[PDB]
């Protein structure tokens, strides 16, 4: 099935980013940066992959998307760009 | 006075609870029918000298206009009280047929001490009509009234369908309630029927849980 994908209109999960999502996007991006992936932010003398990823996240120039699965398997895809980071 | 006065007071206490439960189920029972004082009770159902005459007490009840909007198929209920402490297959078959003839939906039996296993054979024997067995002694106090017992609400086929749809649930995933549960017997919950339970909370003000029957 591909009824598994919930559409953009009709989305119930937090418009805010989970403490776990932040930690995982930050990590995932740090690990990718660390293995010489292209960096989308102007690294202003920056050199630590986690700091570079935190710079990427603050500017919301992270090309990743969170597939938030529900107890039944259906999911809501949220972008790092579109997620509020109040944390 | 002796102990006949206490058996009268006790029968009356259990009577108020049957009225309370028959109302709470969804039927048309006045607050006056419920709050029937002890002296007035004696006056109605007491013989030549003043002893309890249970045979008379037996009553039919009809659904409120509200009950027919939510559960249209919920028909009429018949309550029966027996003057024999032990109820035998002879006095039982009288009741079973009365529910069959009057095309009754549900029937409640308020037995004093016991129902013979021969009489008990006749309980499922007449579907769609469902027969309920209640001990007179248990009904004295309304459990539903207790401090700890929250409000349970029967959900219509639609109300349930919506719940499972709105929470992406399988009937399994739902918290369960036993068919024998004191509140489930009170509301006459049949298997599958979902109950909605509203309790107060120290975190939110109110909280609503749901329990599926077993």
mmCIF file of C-alpha atoms in Angstrom:
data_model
loop_
_atom_site.group_PDB
_atom_site.id
_atom_site.type_symbol
_atom_site.label_atom_id
_atom_site.label_comp_id
_atom_site.label_asym_id
_atom_site.label_seq_id
_atom_site.Cartn_x
_atom_site.Cartn_y
_atom_site.Cartn_z
ATOM 1 C CA UNK A 1 0.000 0.000 0.000
ATOM 2 C CA UNK A 2 0.914 3.694 -0.567
ATOM 3 C CA UNK A 3 -2.180 4.872 1.343
ATOM 4 C CA UNK A 4 0.593 4.811 4.023
ATOM 5 C CA UNK A 5 1.515 8.381 2.958
ATOM 6 C CA UNK A 6 -0.679 11.031 4.700
ATOM 7 C CA UNK A 7 -1.056 14.196 2.471
ATOM 8 C CA UNK A 8 0.318 17.764 3.335
ATOM 9 C CA UNK A 9 -3.243 19.051 3.947
ATOM 10 C CA UNK A 10 -4.504 16.938 6.932
ATOM 11 C CA UNK A 11 -1.404 16.593 9.120
ATOM 12 C CA UNK A 12 -1.767 16.301 12.924
ATOM 13 C CA UNK A 13 1.758 15.997 14.407
ATOM 14 C CA UNK A 14 3.513 18.922 16.219
ATOM 15 C CA UNK A 15 4.419 21.824 13.996
ATOM 16 C CA UNK A 16 7.421 22.035 16.374
ATOM 17 C CA UNK A 17 10.527 19.748 16.195
ATOM 18 C CA UNK A 18 10.942 16.866 18.785
ATOM 19 C CA UNK A 19 14.059 16.899 21.048
ATOM 20 C CA UNK A 20 14.986 13.580 19.407
ATOM 21 C CA UNK A 21 14.471 14.897 15.811
ATOM 22 C CA UNK A 22 16.873 17.822 16.522
ATOM 23 C CA UNK A 23 19.478 15.476 18.041
ATOM 24 C CA UNK A 24 19.116 13.089 15.042
ATOM 25 C CA UNK A 25 19.056 15.747 12.260
ATOM 26 C CA UNK A 26 22.047 17.461 13.928
ATOM 27 C CA UNK A 27 23.848 14.114 14.203
ATOM 28 C CA UNK A 28 22.899 12.826 10.741
ATOM 29 C CA UNK A 29 24.052 16.081 9.105
ATOM 30 C CA UNK A 30 27.254 16.179 11.263
ATOM 31 C CA UNK A 31 28.121 12.629 10.196
ATOM 32 C CA UNK A 32 27.418 13.475 6.527
ATOM 33 C CA UNK A 33 29.453 16.812 6.758
ATOM 34 C CA UNK A 34 32.177 14.734 8.500
ATOM 35 C CA UNK A 35 32.372 12.328 5.574
ATOM 36 C CA UNK A 36 32.929 15.299 3.123
ATOM 37 C CA UNK A 37 29.299 15.851 2.044
ATOM 38 C CA UNK A 38 28.476 19.271 0.426
ATOM 39 C CA UNK A 39 27.835 22.058 2.980
ATOM 40 C CA UNK A 40 24.873 24.408 2.165
ATOM 41 C CA UNK A 41 25.798 27.165 4.632
ATOM 42 C CA UNK A 42 28.574 29.719 4.524
ATOM 43 C CA UNK A 43 30.928 28.193 7.218
ATOM 44 C CA UNK A 44 32.148 31.331 8.819
ATOM 45 C CA UNK A 45 35.561 29.951 9.780
ATOM 46 C CA UNK A 46 33.700 26.887 11.175
ATOM 47 C CA UNK A 47 35.458 23.483 11.342
ATOM 48 C CA UNK A 48 33.518 21.093 13.677
ATOM 49 C CA UNK A 49 30.909 19.004 11.796
ATOM 50 C CA UNK A 50 28.401 19.317 14.620
ATOM 51 C CA UNK A 51 28.848 23.115 14.739
ATOM 52 C CA UNK A 52 28.617 23.280 10.927
ATOM 53 C CA UNK A 53 25.373 21.224 11.162
ATOM 54 C CA UNK A 54 24.049 23.536 13.919
ATOM 55 C CA UNK A 55 24.893 26.469 11.567
ATOM 56 C CA UNK A 56 23.087 24.559 8.750
ATOM 57 C CA UNK A 57 20.034 24.059 11.069
ATOM 58 C CA UNK A 58 19.825 27.644 12.277
ATOM 59 C CA UNK A 59 19.817 28.860 8.652
ATOM 60 C CA UNK A 60 17.320 26.020 7.838
ATOM 61 C CA UNK A 61 19.498 24.987 4.875
ATOM 62 C CA UNK A 62 19.259 21.269 5.824
ATOM 63 C CA UNK A 63 17.940 19.197 2.847
ATOM 64 C CA UNK A 64 16.512 16.422 5.061
ATOM 65 C CA UNK A 65 12.861 15.394 5.655
ATOM 66 C CA UNK A 66 11.422 13.628 8.752
ATOM 67 C CA UNK A 67 9.080 10.698 7.997
ATOM 68 C CA UNK A 68 7.016 10.592 11.193
ATOM 69 C CA UNK A 69 5.354 7.169 11.356
ATOM 70 C CA UNK A 70 2.073 6.543 13.228
ATOM 71 C CA UNK A 71 1.087 3.415 15.299
ATOM 72 C CA UNK A 72 -0.591 1.898 12.178
ATOM 73 C CA UNK A 73 2.319 2.623 9.795
ATOM 74 C CA UNK A 74 0.963 5.696 8.058
ATOM 75 C CA UNK A 75 3.366 8.670 8.020
ATOM 76 C CA UNK A 76 3.539 12.469 7.788
ATOM 77 C CA UNK A 77 6.636 13.823 5.994
ATOM 78 C CA UNK A 78 7.806 17.047 7.586
ATOM 79 C CA UNK A 79 10.780 19.033 6.385
ATOM 80 C CA UNK A 80 13.646 20.350 8.513
ATOM 81 C CA UNK A 81 12.921 23.748 6.819
ATOM 82 C CA UNK A 82 9.159 23.682 7.875
ATOM 83 C CA UNK A 83 9.685 22.519 11.485
ATOM 84 C CA UNK A 84 9.620 25.112 14.305
ATOM 85 C CA UNK A 85 12.741 24.869 16.524
ATOM 86 C CA UNK A 86 11.601 26.411 19.934
ATOM 87 C CA UNK A 87 13.818 23.881 21.918
ATOM 88 C CA UNK B 1 -40.342 -4.829 64.614
ATOM 89 C CA UNK B 2 -38.143 -8.035 64.788
ATOM 90 C CA UNK B 3 -36.191 -8.722 61.508
ATOM 91 C CA UNK B 4 -39.049 -8.466 58.989
ATOM 92 C CA UNK B 5 -38.714 -4.655 59.109
ATOM 93 C CA UNK B 6 -35.033 -4.948 58.092
ATOM 94 C CA UNK B 7 -35.922 -7.334 55.171
ATOM 95 C CA UNK B 8 -38.539 -4.745 54.047
ATOM 96 C CA UNK B 9 -36.039 -1.802 54.331
ATOM 97 C CA UNK B 10 -33.442 -3.930 52.419
ATOM 98 C CA UNK B 11 -35.879 -4.995 49.632
ATOM 99 C CA UNK B 12 -36.774 -1.301 49.208
ATOM 100 C CA UNK B 13 -33.047 -0.287 49.047
ATOM 101 C CA UNK B 14 -32.515 -2.851 46.228
ATOM 102 C CA UNK B 15 -35.719 -1.659 44.513
ATOM 103 C CA UNK B 16 -34.481 2.016 44.280
ATOM 104 C CA UNK B 17 -31.259 0.690 42.661
ATOM 105 C CA UNK B 18 -33.297 -1.303 40.000
ATOM 106 C CA UNK B 19 -35.254 1.881 39.216
ATOM 107 C CA UNK B 20 -31.920 3.882 39.198
ATOM 108 C CA UNK B 21 -30.269 1.300 36.795
ATOM 109 C CA UNK B 22 -33.368 1.014 34.511
ATOM 110 C CA UNK B 23 -33.290 4.877 34.218
ATOM 111 C CA UNK B 24 -29.478 5.001 33.786
ATOM 112 C CA UNK B 25 -29.740 2.371 30.986
ATOM 113 C CA UNK B 26 -31.765 4.883 28.998
ATOM 114 C CA UNK B 27 -35.379 4.143 29.995
ATOM 115 C CA UNK B 28 -38.175 6.550 31.141
ATOM 116 C CA UNK B 29 -38.292 6.569 34.942
ATOM 117 C CA UNK B 30 -39.186 9.693 36.925
ATOM 118 C CA UNK B 31 -37.160 10.997 39.844
ATOM 119 C CA UNK B 32 -40.362 10.501 41.865
ATOM 120 C CA UNK B 33 -40.444 6.760 40.803
ATOM 121 C CA UNK B 34 -36.853 6.474 42.154
ATOM 122 C CA UNK B 35 -37.241 8.576 45.363
ATOM 123 C CA UNK B 36 -40.300 6.497 46.486
ATOM 124 C CA UNK B 37 -40.123 6.561 50.358
ATOM 125 C CA UNK B 38 -40.235 3.403 52.541
ATOM 126 C CA UNK B 39 -43.743 4.098 54.034
ATOM 127 C CA UNK B 40 -45.257 4.555 50.530
ATOM 128 C CA UNK B 41 -43.443 1.322 49.373
ATOM 129 C CA UNK B 42 -45.044 -0.701 52.259
ATOM 130 C CA UNK B 43 -48.456 0.781 51.343
ATOM 131 C CA UNK B 44 -48.209 -0.485 47.729
ATOM 132 C CA UNK B 45 -46.632 -3.985 47.928
ATOM 133 C CA UNK B 46 -47.615 -5.303 51.420
ATOM 134 C CA UNK B 47 -50.286 -8.032 52.046
ATOM 135 C CA UNK B 48 -53.083 -8.706 54.667
ATOM 136 C CA UNK B 49 -50.817 -7.793 57.611
ATOM 137 C CA UNK B 50 -47.735 -6.001 56.140
ATOM 138 C CA UNK B 51 -45.183 -8.468 54.647
ATOM 139 C CA UNK B 52 -43.453 -7.948 51.221
ATOM 140 C CA UNK B 53 -45.414 -8.972 48.079
ATOM 141 C CA UNK B 54 -42.695 -9.064 45.364
ATOM 142 C CA UNK B 55 -45.013 -10.592 42.665
ATOM 143 C CA UNK B 56 -46.710 -7.132 42.333
ATOM 144 C CA UNK B 57 -43.405 -5.116 42.156
ATOM 145 C CA UNK B 58 -42.556 -6.527 38.642
ATOM 146 C CA UNK B 59 -42.680 -3.708 36.021
ATOM 147 C CA UNK B 60 -42.201 -2.875 32.305
ATOM 148 C CA UNK B 61 -40.110 0.183 31.255
ATOM 149 C CA UNK B 62 -39.872 2.145 27.996
ATOM 150 C CA UNK B 63 -37.000 4.014 26.274
ATOM 151 C CA UNK B 64 -36.754 7.836 26.540
ATOM 152 C CA UNK B 65 -37.093 9.814 23.270
ATOM 153 C CA UNK B 66 -33.337 10.444 23.514
ATOM 154 C CA UNK B 67 -32.583 6.650 23.738
ATOM 155 C CA UNK B 68 -34.459 5.978 20.453
ATOM 156 C CA UNK B 69 -32.346 8.610 18.582
ATOM 157 C CA UNK B 70 -29.020 6.984 19.632
ATOM 158 C CA UNK B 71 -30.178 3.321 19.847
ATOM 159 C CA UNK B 72 -33.389 3.087 17.736
ATOM 160 C CA UNK B 73 -33.523 -0.720 17.997
ATOM 161 C CA UNK B 74 -33.280 -0.569 21.847
ATOM 162 C CA UNK B 75 -36.741 -1.865 22.720
ATOM 163 C CA UNK B 76 -38.716 -2.328 25.932
ATOM 164 C CA UNK B 77 -37.346 -3.866 29.150
ATOM 165 C CA UNK B 78 -39.274 -5.988 31.681
ATOM 166 C CA UNK B 79 -38.142 -6.238 35.365
ATOM 167 C CA UNK B 80 -39.266 -9.275 37.439
ATOM 168 C CA UNK B 81 -39.251 -9.923 41.204
ATOM 169 C CA UNK B 82 -40.027 -13.384 42.665
ATOM 170 C CA UNK B 83 -41.571 -14.133 46.105
ATOM 171 C CA UNK B 84 -39.928 -17.616 46.058
ATOM 172 C CA UNK B 85 -36.322 -17.468 47.503
ATOM 173 C CA UNK B 86 -35.328 -20.279 45.111
ATOM 174 C CA UNK B 87 -36.567 -19.803 41.529
ATOM 175 C CA UNK B 88 -37.387 -23.059 39.717
ATOM 176 C CA UNK B 89 -37.699 -23.978 35.990
ATOM 177 C CA UNK B 90 -41.534 -23.902 36.491
ATOM 178 C CA UNK B 91 -41.768 -20.199 37.577
ATOM 179 C CA UNK B 92 -38.958 -19.287 35.121
ATOM 180 C CA UNK B 93 -40.644 -20.672 31.941
ATOM 181 C CA UNK B 94 -43.598 -18.280 32.763
ATOM 182 C CA UNK B 95 -41.252 -15.244 32.464
ATOM 183 C CA UNK B 96 -39.290 -16.542 29.340
ATOM 184 C CA UNK B 97 -42.602 -16.920 27.406
ATOM 185 C CA UNK B 98 -43.952 -13.519 28.661
ATOM 186 C CA UNK B 99 -40.881 -11.842 27.006
ATOM 187 C CA UNK B 100 -41.432 -13.957 23.816
ATOM 188 C CA UNK B 101 -45.157 -13.054 23.496
ATOM 189 C CA UNK B 102 -44.881 -9.328 24.415
ATOM 190 C CA UNK B 103 -41.996 -9.198 21.778
ATOM 191 C CA UNK B 104 -39.664 -7.744 24.448
ATOM 192 C CA UNK B 105 -36.092 -6.705 23.646
ATOM 193 C CA UNK B 106 -34.548 -7.352 27.122
ATOM 194 C CA UNK B 107 -35.688 -8.893 30.437
ATOM 195 C CA UNK B 108 -34.237 -8.556 33.976
ATOM 196 C CA UNK B 109 -34.740 -11.153 36.762
ATOM 197 C CA UNK B 110 -34.278 -10.165 40.423
ATOM 198 C CA UNK B 111 -33.900 -13.502 42.280
ATOM 199 C CA UNK B 112 -33.893 -13.645 46.104
ATOM 200 C CA UNK B 113 -31.409 -16.504 46.871
ATOM 201 C CA UNK B 114 -30.804 -18.795 43.830
ATOM 202 C CA UNK B 115 -31.940 -19.881 40.349
ATOM 203 C CA UNK B 116 -31.905 -23.674 39.740
ATOM 204 C CA UNK B 117 -29.513 -24.829 36.927
ATOM 205 C CA UNK B 118 -32.621 -26.282 35.150
ATOM 206 C CA UNK B 119 -34.193 -22.776 34.987
ATOM 207 C CA UNK B 120 -30.834 -21.241 33.884
ATOM 208 C CA UNK B 121 -30.949 -23.360 30.635
ATOM 209 C CA UNK B 122 -33.840 -21.076 29.424
ATOM 210 C CA UNK B 123 -31.774 -17.774 29.586
ATOM 211 C CA UNK B 124 -30.107 -17.889 26.065
ATOM 212 C CA UNK B 125 -32.954 -20.085 24.677
ATOM 213 C CA UNK B 126 -34.964 -17.133 23.288
ATOM 214 C CA UNK B 127 -32.854 -14.711 21.070
ATOM 215 C CA UNK B 128 -32.970 -11.769 19.931
ATOM 216 C CA UNK B 129 -34.361 -11.201 23.460
ATOM 217 C CA UNK B 130 -31.618 -11.177 26.075
ATOM 218 C CA UNK B 131 -32.278 -12.280 29.674
ATOM 219 C CA UNK B 132 -30.388 -10.852 32.681
ATOM 220 C CA UNK B 133 -29.909 -12.522 36.092
ATOM 221 C CA UNK B 134 -29.515 -10.240 39.092
ATOM 222 C CA UNK B 135 -29.272 -11.175 42.790
ATOM 223 C CA UNK B 136 -31.620 -9.062 44.923
ATOM 224 C CA UNK B 137 -28.986 -8.975 47.695
ATOM 225 C CA UNK B 138 -26.281 -7.417 45.395
ATOM 226 C CA UNK B 139 -28.627 -4.568 44.184
ATOM 227 C CA UNK B 140 -29.134 -3.175 47.777
ATOM 228 C CA UNK B 141 -26.318 -0.701 47.191
ATOM 229 C CA UNK B 142 -25.821 1.004 43.846
ATOM 230 C CA UNK B 143 -22.085 0.445 43.123
ATOM 231 C CA UNK B 144 -22.180 3.162 40.417
ATOM 232 C CA UNK B 145 -22.823 5.685 43.197
ATOM 233 C CA UNK B 146 -19.465 4.962 44.982
ATOM 234 C CA UNK B 147 -16.687 7.581 45.341
ATOM 235 C CA UNK B 148 -14.240 5.596 43.139
ATOM 236 C CA UNK B 149 -16.720 4.377 40.419
ATOM 237 C CA UNK B 150 -16.559 6.925 37.430
ATOM 238 C CA UNK B 151 -19.205 7.542 34.764
ATOM 239 C CA UNK B 152 -19.436 4.838 32.122
ATOM 240 C CA UNK B 153 -21.245 5.622 28.862
ATOM 241 C CA UNK B 154 -22.403 3.016 26.261
ATOM 242 C CA UNK B 155 -21.401 3.984 22.726
ATOM 243 C CA UNK B 156 -23.613 3.461 19.667
ATOM 244 C CA UNK B 157 -22.258 1.358 16.697
ATOM 245 C CA UNK B 158 -21.489 4.766 15.063
ATOM 246 C CA UNK B 159 -19.909 6.327 18.219
ATOM 247 C CA UNK B 160 -17.539 3.245 18.364
ATOM 248 C CA UNK B 161 -16.769 3.165 14.600
ATOM 249 C CA UNK B 162 -15.835 6.858 14.804
ATOM 250 C CA UNK B 163 -13.574 6.234 17.858
ATOM 251 C CA UNK B 164 -11.569 3.447 16.152
ATOM 252 C CA UNK B 165 -11.418 5.551 12.935
ATOM 253 C CA UNK B 166 -10.278 8.707 14.824
ATOM 254 C CA UNK B 167 -7.545 6.874 16.785
ATOM 255 C CA UNK B 168 -6.484 4.450 13.885
ATOM 256 C CA UNK B 169 -7.374 1.527 16.169
ATOM 257 C CA UNK B 170 -8.130 -2.188 15.811
ATOM 258 C CA UNK B 171 -10.737 -3.469 18.290
ATOM 259 C CA UNK B 172 -7.791 -5.227 20.073
ATOM 260 C CA UNK B 173 -5.645 -2.054 20.723
ATOM 261 C CA UNK B 174 -8.522 -0.715 22.886
ATOM 262 C CA UNK B 175 -8.425 -1.071 26.736
ATOM 263 C CA UNK B 176 -10.836 -3.817 27.696
ATOM 264 C CA UNK B 177 -13.621 -4.336 30.323
ATOM 265 C CA UNK B 178 -14.954 -7.745 31.482
ATOM 266 C CA UNK B 179 -18.555 -8.694 30.497
ATOM 267 C CA UNK B 180 -18.964 -9.560 34.195
ATOM 268 C CA UNK B 181 -17.653 -6.077 35.362
ATOM 269 C CA UNK B 182 -20.061 -4.601 38.000
ATOM 270 C CA UNK B 183 -20.600 -1.479 35.814
ATOM 271 C CA UNK B 184 -20.867 -3.584 32.586
ATOM 272 C CA UNK B 185 -23.688 -5.661 34.177
ATOM 273 C CA UNK B 186 -25.311 -2.426 35.409
ATOM 274 C CA UNK B 187 -25.308 -0.880 31.907
ATOM 275 C CA UNK B 188 -26.101 -4.316 30.391
ATOM 276 C CA UNK B 189 -23.044 -4.212 28.140
ATOM 277 C CA UNK B 190 -22.944 -6.931 25.503
ATOM 278 C CA UNK B 191 -19.599 -8.092 23.913
ATOM 279 C CA UNK B 192 -18.121 -5.613 21.433
ATOM 280 C CA UNK B 193 -20.053 -2.612 22.877
ATOM 281 C CA UNK B 194 -17.591 0.142 23.817
ATOM 282 C CA UNK B 195 -17.944 2.146 27.065
ATOM 283 C CA UNK B 196 -16.564 5.703 27.453
ATOM 284 C CA UNK B 197 -15.296 6.479 30.932
ATOM 285 C CA UNK B 198 -15.072 10.059 32.247
ATOM 286 C CA UNK B 199 -13.082 10.538 35.483
ATOM 287 C CA UNK B 200 -11.601 13.623 37.034
ATOM 288 C CA UNK B 201 -7.758 14.020 36.784
ATOM 289 C CA UNK B 202 -5.130 15.775 38.956
ATOM 290 C CA UNK B 203 -3.176 16.671 35.761
ATOM 291 C CA UNK B 204 -6.081 17.809 33.448
ATOM 292 C CA UNK B 205 -9.503 18.516 34.923
ATOM 293 C CA UNK B 206 -11.275 15.644 33.184
ATOM 294 C CA UNK B 207 -9.918 12.705 31.154
ATOM 295 C CA UNK B 208 -11.786 10.284 28.953
ATOM 296 C CA UNK B 209 -10.761 6.674 28.530
ATOM 297 C CA UNK B 210 -12.612 3.940 26.521
ATOM 298 C CA UNK B 211 -13.140 0.281 27.353
ATOM 299 C CA UNK B 212 -14.256 -2.405 24.874
ATOM 300 C CA UNK B 213 -16.375 -5.346 26.209
ATOM 301 C CA UNK B 214 -15.319 -9.011 26.535
#
